[PDB]
Design an enzyme around this catalytic site. Structure first.
Site, PDB file in Angstrom:
ATOM      1  N   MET A   1      18.660 -42.281  14.301  1.00 45.38           N
ATOM      2  CA  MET A   1      17.703 -42.857  15.233  1.00 45.38           C
ATOM      3  C   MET A   1      16.305 -42.360  14.889  1.00 45.38           C
ATOM      4  O   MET A   1      16.099 -41.158  14.690  1.00 45.38           O
ATOM      5  CB  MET A   1      18.060 -42.488  16.673  1.00 45.38           C
ATOM      6  CG  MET A   1      19.533 -42.665  17.010  1.00 45.38           C
ATOM      7  SD  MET A   1      19.904 -42.354  18.748  1.00 45.38           S
ATOM      8  CE  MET A   1      19.081 -43.746  19.520  1.00 45.38           C
ATOM      9  N   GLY A   2      15.354 -43.286  14.811  1.00 43.63           N
ATOM     10  CA  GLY A   2      13.981 -42.920  14.536  1.00 43.63           C
ATOM     11  C   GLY A   2      13.788 -42.348  13.138  1.00 43.63           C
ATOM     12  O   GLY A   2      14.566 -42.591  12.211  1.00 43.63           O
ATOM     13  N   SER A   3      12.717 -41.569  13.002  1.00 46.46           N
ATOM     14  CA  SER A   3      12.374 -40.941  11.735  1.00 46.46           C
ATOM     15  C   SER A   3      11.755 -39.578  12.013  1.00 46.46           C
ATOM     16  O   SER A   3      11.488 -39.215  13.161  1.00 46.46           O
ATOM     17  CB  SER A   3      11.423 -41.820  10.913  1.00 46.46           C
ATOM     18  OG  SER A   3      10.265 -42.155  11.658  1.00 46.46           O
TER      19      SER A   3
ATOM     20  N   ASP B   1       4.702 -29.144  26.397  1.00 45.18           N
ATOM     21  CA  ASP B   1       4.525 -30.293  25.510  1.00 45.18           C
ATOM     22  C   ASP B   1       4.977 -31.602  26.150  1.00 45.18           C
ATOM     23  O   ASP B   1       5.926 -32.232  25.671  1.00 45.18           O
ATOM     24  CB  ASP B   1       5.285 -30.084  24.197  1.00 45.18           C
ATOM     25  CG  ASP B   1       4.740 -30.939  23.068  1.00 45.18           C
ATOM     26  OD1 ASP B   1       3.663 -31.546  23.245  1.00 45.18           O
ATOM     27  OD2 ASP B   1       5.389 -31.003  22.003  1.00 45.18           O
TER      28      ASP B   1
HETATM   29  C1  LIG Z   1       9.930 -41.539  21.222  1.00 45.57           C
HETATM   30  C2  LIG Z   1      11.439 -41.561  20.979  1.00 45.57           C
HETATM   31  C3  LIG Z   1      11.703 -41.384  19.483  1.00 45.57           C
HETATM   32  O1  LIG Z   1      10.914 -41.826  18.650  1.00 45.57           O
HETATM   33  N1  LIG Z   1      12.836 -40.744  19.162  1.00 45.57           N
HETATM   34  C4  LIG Z   1      13.148 -40.534  17.730  1.00 45.57           C
HETATM   35  C5  LIG Z   1      14.630 -40.673  17.448  1.00 45.57           C
HETATM   36  C6  LIG Z   1      15.429 -39.842  18.429  1.00 45.57           C
HETATM   37  C7  LIG Z   1      15.209 -40.394  19.823  1.00 45.57           C
HETATM   38  N2  LIG Z   1      16.106 -39.728  20.788  1.00 45.57           N
HETATM   39  N3  LIG Z   1      16.189 -38.410  20.977  1.00 45.57           N
HETATM   40  C8  LIG Z   1      17.104 -38.215  21.917  1.00 45.57           C
HETATM   41  C9  LIG Z   1      17.431 -36.992  22.341  1.00 45.57           C
HETATM   42  C10 LIG Z   1      16.910 -35.870  21.854  1.00 45.57           C
HETATM   43  N4  LIG Z   1      17.477 -34.862  22.513  1.00 45.57           N
HETATM   44  C11 LIG Z   1      17.211 -33.414  22.315  1.00 45.57           C
HETATM   45  C12 LIG Z   1      18.095 -32.889  21.180  1.00 45.57           C
HETATM   46  F1  LIG Z   1      19.328 -33.343  21.343  1.00 45.57           F
HETATM   47  F2  LIG Z   1      17.618 -33.316  20.015  1.00 45.57           F
HETATM   48  C13 LIG Z   1      18.119 -31.358  21.188  1.00 45.57           C
HETATM   49  C14 LIG Z   1      19.073 -30.683  21.941  1.00 45.57           C
HETATM   50  C15 LIG Z   1      19.100 -29.293  21.945  1.00 45.57           C
HETATM   51  C16 LIG Z   1      18.174 -28.578  21.195  1.00 45.57           C
HETATM   52  C17 LIG Z   1      17.221 -29.251  20.440  1.00 45.57           C
HETATM   53  C18 LIG Z   1      17.194 -30.642  20.435  1.00 45.57           C
HETATM   54  N5  LIG Z   1      18.347 -35.375  23.400  1.00 45.57           N
HETATM   55  N6  LIG Z   1      18.316 -36.710  23.288  1.00 45.57           N
HETATM   56  C19 LIG Z   1      17.604 -39.391  22.322  1.00 45.57           C
HETATM   57  C20 LIG Z   1      18.529 -39.756  23.223  1.00 45.57           C
HETATM   58  N7  LIG Z   1      19.135 -38.794  23.912  1.00 45.57           N
HETATM   59  N8  LIG Z   1      18.846 -41.039  23.439  1.00 45.57           N
HETATM   60  C21 LIG Z   1      18.200 -42.031  22.705  1.00 45.57           C
HETATM   61  N9  LIG Z   1      17.242 -41.632  21.773  1.00 45.57           N
HETATM   62  C22 LIG Z   1      16.969 -40.329  21.606  1.00 45.57           C
HETATM   63  C23 LIG Z   1      13.748 -40.228  20.215  1.00 45.57           C
END
Ligand SMILES: *CCC(=O)N1CCC[C@@H](n2nc(-c3cn(CC(F)(F)c4ccccc4)nn3)c3c(N)ncnc32)C1
Length: 276
Positions: A25-27, A140
């Site tokens: 997902m994403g970059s 942030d």
């Molecule tokens: C602006 C949104 C965007 O461009 N993106 C890039 C691709 C990933 C997208 N995304 N991230 C999550 C997500 C992220 N987390 C946090 C973590 F799991 F990465 C994490 C957990 C513990 C420690 C460090 C990091 N949780 N979810 C997304 C979710 N959950 N659903 C859909 N897309 C997500 C955001």
């Protein structure tokens, strides 16, 4: 405990082989979209490589710690489980739709106040939860950290900074997250980042300190409550910026705590629109 997935109160025994990789997902951080072969659920999976950078891995573990403790906050992206292999750590998170930044880009314009009201209620309560129950300061807040899904949920993620959303006191030395939220609200409400035509991060900081707070315009039909909430968030003097206790009593928050807003249908309408 690791090696289990908990979706909807159902704990499933699972290993990394039980997940089908549906693509990144994403970059730019590597978050996969994966399918749990035993139930059919689709989830977001963060992969932390053992050979990765010891600095980024140290940050992922501390952020995972806060996420694992935030199981009782409905405004924080929830963790379904973890997998620890000999070379990797996989963190399973609930799959959301997209972030507010990409909703803005797909909208190609302002986001209605009704949607931003529900978003404001969710993010403030998520920040107040982190502060009161865990003593965590986000440091942030920005539209890329605000996630929405087809079911109308609005949740916060990726905490643990970006100079564009830095508060005046963080630039030139508690409530610093309040300022970043106000900047995010102005950007989403107008479709334009309030500090325009800044070629460097330092140029943004100078405008933050030298220029007046970028409040909401008065010719877009914004309610007085919304304009007041943003003006309160964008208080440059951090000693006069309200606490989370004071923000939660603001009439803008009280209105959208009880008002019925169909975020789900609005989310699906925006996603149906095409940029490519
Ligand atoms: C602006 C949104 C965007 O461009 N993106 C890039 C691709 C990933 C997208 N995304 N991230 C999550 C997500 C992220 N987390 C946090 C973590 F799991 F990465 C994490 C957990 C513990 C420690 C460090 C990091 N949780 N979810 C997304 C979710 N959950 N659903 C859909 N897309 C997500 C955001």
């Amino acid at each position: 405990q690791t090696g289990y997935l908990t979706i909807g109160g159902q704990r499933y025994q699972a290993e990394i082989n039980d997940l089908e990789n549906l693509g990144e997902m994403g970059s730019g951080g590597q978050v996969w979209k994966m399918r749990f072969r035993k139930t059919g659920h689709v989830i977001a999976v963060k992969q932390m490589r053992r050979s990765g950078n010891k600095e980024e891995n140290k940050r992922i573990l501390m952020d995972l710690d806060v996420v694992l403790k935030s199981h009782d906050c409905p405004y924080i992206v929830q963790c379904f489980g973890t997998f620890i292999t000999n070379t990797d750590v996989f963190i399973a998170m609930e799959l959301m739709g997209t972030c507010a930044e990409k909703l803005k880009k797909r909208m190609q314009g302002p986001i209605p106040e009704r949607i931003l009201g529900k978003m404001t209620v969710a993010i403030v309560k998520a920040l107040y939860y982190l502060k009161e129950k865990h003593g965590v300061i986000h440091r942030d807040v920005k539209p890329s950290n605000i996630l929405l899904d087809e079911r109308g949920q609005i949740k916060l993620c990726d905490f643990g900074g970006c100079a564009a959303y830095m508060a005046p006191e963080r630039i030139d030395p508690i409530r610093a997250d309040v300022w970043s939220l106000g900047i995010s609200l102005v950007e989403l409400a107008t479709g334009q980042f309030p500090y325009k035509n800044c070629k460097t991060d330092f140029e943004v900081l100078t405008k933050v300190l030298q220029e007046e707070p970028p409040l909401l315009p008065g010719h877009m039909g914004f309610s007085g409550d919304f304009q007041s909430f943003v003006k309160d968030c964008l208080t440059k003097d951090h000693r006069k910026r309200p606490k989370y206790n004071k923000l939660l009593e603001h009439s803008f928050i009280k209105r959208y705590e009880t008002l019925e807003v169909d975020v789900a249908s609005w989310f699906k309408d925006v996603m149906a629109k095409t940029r490519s």
